[PDB]
From Swiss-Prot:
Annotated protein name in UniProt: Occludin
Modified residues (Phosphoserine): D77
OCEL domain: residues covered: 3-109
Top-level taxonomic group: Eukaryota
Family note: Belongs to the ELL/occludin family.
Name of encoding gene: OCLN
């Protein structure tokens, strides 16, 4: 919900190429953000497996639980959540630019 005023339907090859460059720049940021947000989920996933593995009374289990809770906290704080929101914004914009480019290319084909 919307990007058309910044990136309206294309009317020239040069405007198309400009959109592609902007798309490539945004895609890189999108991917970097995906990886960054994913570092916590992968770690939480491995911690989940460790909780399944260790005896509930062990120090190992307590250590896993503390870390899992630490990460859950980070995942819920402002930095993480805004990064996530930013990632969604970028995804939406990227999807829109890809559509404008595809539409333009389609009518020349």
């Amino acid at each position: 919900e919307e990007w058309i005023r910044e990136y309206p339907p294309i009317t020239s090859d040069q405007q198309r190429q400009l959109y592609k460059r902007n798309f490539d720049t945004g895609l890189q940021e999108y991917k970097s953000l995906q990886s960054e947000l994913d570092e916590i989920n992968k770690e939480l996933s491995r911690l989940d497996k460790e909780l399944d593995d260790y005896r509930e009374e062990s120090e190992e289990y307590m250590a896993a639980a503390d870390e899992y809770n630490r990460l859950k906290q980070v995942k819920g704080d402002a930095d993480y959540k805004s990064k996530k929101n930013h990632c969604k914004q970028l995804k939406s914009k990227l999807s829109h630019i890809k559509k404008m480019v595809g539409d333009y290319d389609r009518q020349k084909t």
